[PDB]
């Protein structure tokens, strides 16, 4: 549901950027210059949204942290690759939907490859094409700048390039669908565990992260209240905060090697047959 909500939010963001008044497109009708603009208008929003989907997903930062302090190449062909699959999923949701939307609009590709259409190879007009002014008048086709002598030629070349754009767009969404199917079949075939145990593991990681955020906020609040009380002599707590101080007294916090034993990417090591679903769980069973 949360992954479906993130996919719906990414689709709504691409649809909002898809119909932008000036962001959507402004084709330069110029030879050897417009396909660079098409490459820009498809790729740089794709690369920006791909980078942003890397940025907003925290499991990338878990991965560079595990590469940083451990650095022992323990992240083999493992659930670290499943983490990377989730990274590329929640990241590359947005560049491929930007690419298929701005390919089904067709505008970037007809602006792009208009400089490379052969003048004598197309139809629906007479061959009034001086070779010295060939590619220059070819490039002015997406701006509706062709004269009445080549208006039908311009409509024919525009329809042909819009065909090739939409065919390339449908083929690209087909190959990204088959890549999603292939990575999911490869995940469920190279998994060491079930799908029911994988769902239980997903519910465990969700419950552990939610409980850990709640109790880290509460333990931090109790530590802050102890420091504040040591400073002034009292703490201005709420009623619920006074209940938090009454319920969970602390004295000290776990050292940095303990926090290092907690952190890392997820694992599925098994302590004597019994499974360990997270590094916190591995550390708790280790004591």
Span 34-93, contacts to its own copies by CB under 8 A: 34, 36-37, 40-41, 44-45, 47-48, 51-52, 54-55, 58, 61-62, 64-65, 68-69
Minimal distance in Å, beta carbon 130 to its own copies? 13
Q: Which is nearer to its own copies, 28 or 129 (CB)?
A: 28
For its own copies, the binding residues in 251-280 under the rule CB under 8 A are 252-256, 258-260, 262-263, 270, 273-275, 277-278, 280
Which of these segments, 8-16, 31-39, 80-88, 90-98, binds its own copies (CB under 8 A)? 31-39
User: Residue 14 in contact with residue 97, Cβ under 8 Å?
Assistant: yes
Q: How many residues touch its own copies (CB under 8 A)?
A: 120
Q: What is the number of other CB atoms lying within 10 angstroms of the CB of residue 107?
A: 20
| DSSP assignment letter at 121 | T
Q: Is 173 in the site for its own copies (CB under 8 A)?
A: yes
Cα(116)–Cα(190) distance, integer angstroms: 46
CA separation, residue 132 to residues 127, 136, 150, 167 (Å): 14, 9, 17, 32
Residue range at the interface with its own copies (CB under 8 A); choices 6-14, 76-84, 112-120, 232-240:
232-240
Q: Per the structure block, which two tokens stand in for 277?
A: 């679903």
Per-residue x/- marks for its own copies, 120-159, CB under 8 A?
A: ---xx-----------x---x--x-x------x---x--x
Q: Which contacts (CB < 8 Å, 24+ apart) does range 251-260 have?
A: 253/219, 253/223, 258/283, 260/69
Beta strands at 270-271 and 274-275: parallel, antiparallel or unpaired: antiparallel
Rule CB under 8 A: which of 194-213 touch its own copies?
194-197, 199-200, 203-204, 206-208, 211-213
């Amino acid at each position: 549901d949360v992954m479906i909500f993130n996919g719906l939010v990414a689709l709504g963001t691409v649809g909002s950027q898809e119909l932008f008044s000036v962001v959507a497109f402004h084709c330069p009708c110029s030879p050897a210059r417009n396909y660079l603009y098409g490459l820009a208008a498809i790729g740089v929003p794709a690369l920006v949204l791909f980078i942003i989907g890397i940025i907003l997903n925290n499991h990338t930062w878990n991965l560079v942290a595990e590469c940083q302090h451990r650095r022992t190449k323990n992240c083999s062909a493992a659930p670290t690759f499943l983490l990377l699959s989730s990274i590329l999923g929640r990241a590359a949701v947005a560049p491929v939907t930007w690419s298929v939307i701005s390919l089904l609009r067709g505008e970037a590709y007809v602006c792009a490859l208009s400089e490379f259409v052969d003048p004598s190879s197309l139809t629906a007009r007479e061959e009034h094409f001086p070779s010295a002014h060939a590619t220059e008048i070819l490039a002015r086709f997406p701006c509706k700048e062709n004269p009445d002598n080549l208006s039908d030629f311009r409509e024919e070349v525009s329809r042909r390039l819009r065909y090739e754009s939409q065919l390339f767009g449908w083929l690209l969404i087909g190959v990204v669908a088959i890549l999603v199917f292939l990575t999911k079949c490869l995940k469920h075939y190279c998994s060491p565990l079930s799908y029911r145990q994988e769902a239980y593991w997903a519910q465990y990681r969700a419950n552990e992260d939610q409980l850990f955020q709640r109790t880290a906020e509460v333990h931090s609040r109790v530590l802050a209240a102890n420091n504040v009380r040591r400073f002034f002599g009292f703490v201005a707590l709420n009623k619920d905060d006074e209940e938090l101080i009454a319920n969970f007294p602390v004295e000290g916090t776990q050292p940095r090697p303990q926090w290092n034993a907690i952190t890392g990417v997820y694992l599925y090591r098994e302590n004597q047959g019994l499974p360990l679903y997270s590094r916190l769980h591995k550390w708790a069973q280790g004591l």
